Design a protein around this ligand. Structure first.
Ligand SMILES: [Mg+2]
Ligand SMILES: [Mg+2]
Ligand SMILES: [Mg+2]
Ligand SMILES: [Mg+2]
Ligand SMILES: [Mg+2]
Ligand SMILES: [Mg+2]
Ligand SMILES: [Mg+2]
Ligand SMILES: [Mg+2]
Ligand SMILES: [Mg+2]
Ligand SMILES: [Mg+2]
Ligand SMILES: [Mg+2]
Ligand SMILES: [Mg+2]
Ligand SMILES: [Mg+2]
Ligand SMILES: [Mg+2]
Ligand SMILES: [Mg+2]
Ligand SMILES: [Mg+2]
Ligand SMILES: [Mg+2]
Ligand SMILES: [Mg+2]
Ligand SMILES: [Mg+2]
Ligand SMILES: [Mg+2]
Ligand SMILES: [Mg+2]
Ligand SMILES: [Mg+2]
Ligand SMILES: [Mg+2]
Ligand SMILES: [Mg+2]
Ligand SMILES: [Mg+2]
Ligand SMILES: [Mg+2]
Ligand SMILES: [Mg+2]
Ligand SMILES: [Mg+2]
Ligand SMILES: [Mg+2]
Ligand SMILES: [Mg+2]
Ligand SMILES: [Mg+2]
Ligand SMILES: [Mg+2]
Ligand SMILES: [Mg+2]
Ligand SMILES: [Mg+2]
Ligand SMILES: [Mg+2]
Ligand SMILES: [Mg+2]
Ligand SMILES: [Mg+2]
Ligand SMILES: [Mg+2]
Ligand SMILES: [Mg+2]
Ligand SMILES: [Mg+2]
Ligand SMILES: [Mg+2]
Ligand SMILES: [Mg+2]
Ligand SMILES: [Mg+2]
Ligand SMILES: [Mg+2]
Ligand SMILES: [Mg+2]
Ligand SMILES: [Mg+2]
Lengths: 104, 208, 83, 99
RNA sequence: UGGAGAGUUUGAUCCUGGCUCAGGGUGAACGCUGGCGGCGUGCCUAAGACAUGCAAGUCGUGCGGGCCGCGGGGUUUUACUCCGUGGUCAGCGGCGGACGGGUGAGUAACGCGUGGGUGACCUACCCGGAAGAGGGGGACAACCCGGGGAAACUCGGGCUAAUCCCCCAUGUGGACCCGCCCCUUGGGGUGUGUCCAAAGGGCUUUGCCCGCUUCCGGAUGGGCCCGCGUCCCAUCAGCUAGUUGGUGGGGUAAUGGCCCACCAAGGCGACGACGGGUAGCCGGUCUGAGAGGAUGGCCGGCCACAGGGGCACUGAGACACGGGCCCCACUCCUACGGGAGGCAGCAGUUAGGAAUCUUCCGCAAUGGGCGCAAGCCUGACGGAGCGACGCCGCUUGGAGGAAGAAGCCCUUCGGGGUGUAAACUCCUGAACCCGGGACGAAACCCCCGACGAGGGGACUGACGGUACCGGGGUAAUAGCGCCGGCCAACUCCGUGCCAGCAGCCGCGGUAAUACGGAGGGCGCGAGCGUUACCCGGAUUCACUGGGCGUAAAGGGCGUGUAGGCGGCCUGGGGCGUCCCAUGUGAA
């Protein structure tokens, strides 16, 4: 079976491609606590239907480009800026953490 | 190895009456009488409270020395007795008693077990038919153990076996005297043995 | 090409061959495709030759060339109804 | 020294040229067909295209190409030739292409 | 079926806490010692350099020859020439040299492990099924002249065969463009158009054997893609222009930014990107009560490399260890222009090192390449040789006293030990000596039958006269470490913070069970000790299973971002969680 992941379109900023954040909820090896990891998938979006904030099922597929190896199967729920905002702010904080705290 | 040295010095280092000299023992001289104190120039002094370790070692040495075998070979049996099902304590003795050199002493073919391991090495003993020159061979129940056909009529044999007539053996052995044979019936119980040792200690020693 | 040969499994001076189908390129005693019986040249048991006769005719039906000296084991355990 | 499995080498060179020439034909022969197709030469363009497809399947037979290599090379041909005669031309010769 | 603790901070105590010891392991080495077999195992350094020898070929049933023969022909005879058959050599051609054998340098990576995908693909030889071979033409070596080069070799000229190359024909069928269909990524049909098939040998020769051609399946082997897993350093926080995506083309067996031209401006990172360190991964292995820790050596699977770097050719498959080209670094030959090599194949040599083996036998068995077969080739492999390096089995049967000009002890020659412990009472009989003597080996082949049908009383053994079996028979090697507590084992003399011991605590300063002898004792025994390393004890990185008032440890205090965590009731969903069935988890 070609694997089928579900996630959130956190990026529309591409030509015929959408970045889909997928979360996985698994128990920790030694310590047993449940932990939440995630990774982004570049998904192939032909008629650029699926827009930002959407929740889709992606599917394993014949390669389209480098690292772009998934096609968007079907839409599940429509929009939700919040899910993206959770992702946006995670990258916002990065502006600190550097060699110092700049004026950005 | 197999010790091979002054036997009766250790008859009294360990303490209790040991029978490795054979029937050299019953005539008041397996060193037992006269001097029951340990060998050396310190045999006659009141010792101290031996460490709980010592009394394990001392109890384990009795068992090794009474069957007269290598420590290297002795320990190899203890491993395969804890590994085996059932009580690790008595399983061990079931295997010591199962050794062929001992089954020959037990069946009164040779007056001594020590003197009997040499009897086997020289192929005077058969098992179900074929010769066996191995004191390590593990007899299984049903194995008729006999004296060599060609080598039958001999010195120590004729003497030792005739004095065995009018004598009975352990409940786990049958014996034919006037045909020198007799099967190995059963693996002996802890009750079936008159061994002046507390094996529970001997376990404790290795389970250190 | 897929074959049916003998792989050696005994020890020094104790040959115990094992009858396997395998790719011919692969080494003698390596990852074989499936084992279908054993051989014991010293005849030290009542059953010194055994072979899954059903599976044999499968692999034969899809072109497993057997060694000349392994063929004789199959003719031996009636892998072919010859008469 | 002298391992006479180097016979194998000199034998390759004999082969190397055969392919090298065989497909150097296709190259400069294919080029010709799509050239006549870009001018809508039609009759010439297919009379040349036809013998160019042949020369490909030929080269496939032996060892030079074989497989889908000859196939797609054939396909990349006709595909392009047609889309050039359809730019005002009409395949009025009817050589190697389906109506 | 599974869990032991001890010594050591104090005048003494309880904590805390480190150090050490007892256990198990080893591809080991070093010291003393060393009898036998069997089976394993044996450069951990220099992936340094390598002498010599052998290590991948085969087929005359693909083709034509060269050389040395021998015989039979045509002529009245010779000359000239025709045919047959031996031996040998390479050439052309087919298949194989991409397996097998070696290594761990590199690689933190879809490399490996595990589970899936391929409507994105390939697969020589093998298996099953359907169909086919008609006619013409060409060349290049071998050979034959000629030239250059010291050599390695190289150049020109001429002739010729083929299962070598090529053009027509046949189209079962297949490939391609374009369509009306069914499928749904490039999976199957179907029509018109174009395009593509072939080889001949062998005999007991007009019918059999080995081949050849196109196509459809099967099997085997493999490419590519994805989920998850996979070391340390944050005193490595930002990284990236083919960079990220797109349309189009190239290329491939096939997807893709793999590559190219244009267009868009993306992609990645604290869930650790980028950089640095280290390392082939796994099955497994050692340890541990387990959870865990350590490891990847033999064996098996995969990957990577073949003096270092790069590259294509040939082919079903190679970027090709014993193939080709180029550059570099070495070592050789050099008629100074140039040429020749690559043991990380089996042995072997030298170097480095604490340390790691025979230039042995064999084609008998197993496996592989080619061949119709006969057979050949096979340092794969099967055996032997060396090394207590490991594991296991085995021998040294054991019934008899004591005389120091520097080693038989015990109170200033004194009281007992060694100890039933023999240079000699019996008995059995390792070594050794005679004789028998293997299994491993029945196929390939030839006979009868339908050249697979119980007929092969064809032939086949390196190991090896070895193992095993029977007869004869000799009392016939014992070491090493310990003995103050942990830690089983105590006495005398010498020595006086000296000589020395020492794993930790410590002992030696004249009365030392601690140093050095001796007697005795303990442990183990063809071994015993030392050093090195791993886990253990260590609940001393605490998931099981620890802590932070004074023992080490609460941030100087706050605000709050990410993240972690969340009161009571009802309903849907079923990601976590639980259960059943099932596929996988090779050996
Ligand atoms: Mg050849
Ligand atoms: Mg203090
Ligand atoms: Mg003190
Ligand atoms: Mg104390
Ligand atoms: Mg090395
Ligand atoms: Mg000839
Ligand atoms: Mg030849
Ligand atoms: Mg790195
Ligand atoms: Mg994977
Ligand atoms: Mg010429
Ligand atoms: Mg041809
Ligand atoms: Mg044609
Ligand atoms: Mg490395
Ligand atoms: Mg080298
Ligand atoms: Mg290279
Ligand atoms: Mg090939
Ligand atoms: Mg090619
Ligand atoms: Mg390579
Ligand atoms: Mg090669
Ligand atoms: Mg080589
Ligand atoms: Mg070598
Ligand atoms: Mg040296
Ligand atoms: Mg060797
Ligand atoms: Mg063979
Ligand atoms: Mg070998
Ligand atoms: Mg036989
Ligand atoms: Mg043969
Ligand atoms: Mg037969
Ligand atoms: Mg003590
Ligand atoms: Mg000392
Ligand atoms: Mg003194
Ligand atoms: Mg002393
Ligand atoms: Mg001491
Ligand atoms: Mg031993
Ligand atoms: Mg721990
Ligand atoms: Mg633990
Ligand atoms: Mg805890
Ligand atoms: Mg603590
Ligand atoms: Mg303080
Ligand atoms: Mg404090
Ligand atoms: Mg505070
Ligand atoms: Mg929450
Ligand atoms: Mg809640
Ligand atoms: Mg669920
Ligand atoms: Mg399961
Ligand atoms: Mg398994």
């Amino acid at each position: 079976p070609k694997k089928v992941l579900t996630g959130v379109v956190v990026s529309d900023k591409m030509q015929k491609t959408v970045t889909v954040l997928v979360e996985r909820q698994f128990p920790h090896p030694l310590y047993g606590k449940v932990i939440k990891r995630s990774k982004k998938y570049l998904a192939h979006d032909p008629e650029e239907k699926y827009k930002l904030g959407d929740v889709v099922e992606i599917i394993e597929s014949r390669p389209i480009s480098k690292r772009k190896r998934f096609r968007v199967l079907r839409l599940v729920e429509s929009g939700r800026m919040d899910l993206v905002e959770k992702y946006l702010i995670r990258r916002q904080n990065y502006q600190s953490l550097s060699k110092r705290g700049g004026k950005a | 190895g197999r010790y091979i040295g002054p036997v009766c010095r250790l008859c009294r280092r360990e303490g209790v009456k040991l029978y490795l000299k054979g029937e050299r023992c019953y005539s008041p001289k397996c060193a037992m009488e006269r001097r029951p104190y340990p060998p050396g120039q310190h045999g006659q002094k009141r010792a101290r409270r031996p460490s709980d370790y010592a009394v394990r070692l001392r109890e384990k040495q009795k068992l090794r020395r009474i069957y007269g075998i290598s420590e290297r070979q002795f320990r190899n049996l203890f491993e395969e007795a804890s590994k085996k099902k059932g009580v690790t304590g008595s399983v061990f003795l079931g295997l010591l008693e199962s050794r062929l050199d001992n089954v020959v002493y037990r069946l009164g073919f040779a007056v001594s077990r020590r003197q009997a391991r040499q009897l086997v090495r020289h192929g005077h003993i058969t098992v179900n038919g074929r010769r066996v020159d191995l004191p390590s061979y593990r007899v299984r129940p049903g194995d008729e153990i006999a004296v060599a056909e060609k080598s039958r009529n001999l010195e120590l044999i004729r003497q030792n076996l005739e004095a065995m007539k009018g004598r009975k053996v352990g409940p786990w052995l049958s014996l034919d005297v006037e045909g020198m044979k007799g099967k190995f019936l059963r693996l002996p119980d802890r009750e079936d043995l008159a061994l002046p040792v507390n094996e529970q200690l001997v376990i404790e020693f290795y389970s250190r | 090409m897929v074959k049916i040969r003998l792989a050696r499994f005994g020890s020094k001076h104790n040959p115990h061959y094992r009858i396997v189908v395998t790719d011919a390129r692969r080494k003698r005693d390596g990852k074989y495709i499936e084992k279908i019986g054993y051989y014991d040249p010293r005849k030290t048991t009542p059953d010194w030759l055994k072979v899954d006769v059903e599976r044999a005719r499968y692999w034969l039906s899809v072109g497993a060339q057997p060694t000349d000296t392994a063929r004789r084991l199959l003719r031996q355990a009636g892998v072919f109804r010859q008469e | 020294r002298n391992l006479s499995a180097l016979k194998r080498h000199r034998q390759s060179l004999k082969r190397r040229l055969r392919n090298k020439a065989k497909k150097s034909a296709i190259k400069t022969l294919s080029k010709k067909a799509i050239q006549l197709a870009q001018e809508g030469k039609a009759e010439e363009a297919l009379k040349i295209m036809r013998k160019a497809e042949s020369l490909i399947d030929k080269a496939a037979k032996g060892s030079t190409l074989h497989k889908n290599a000859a196939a797609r090379r054939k396909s990349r041909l006709m595909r392009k030739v047609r889309q050039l005669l359809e730019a005002a031309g009409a395949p009025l010769i009817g050589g190697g292409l389906s109506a």
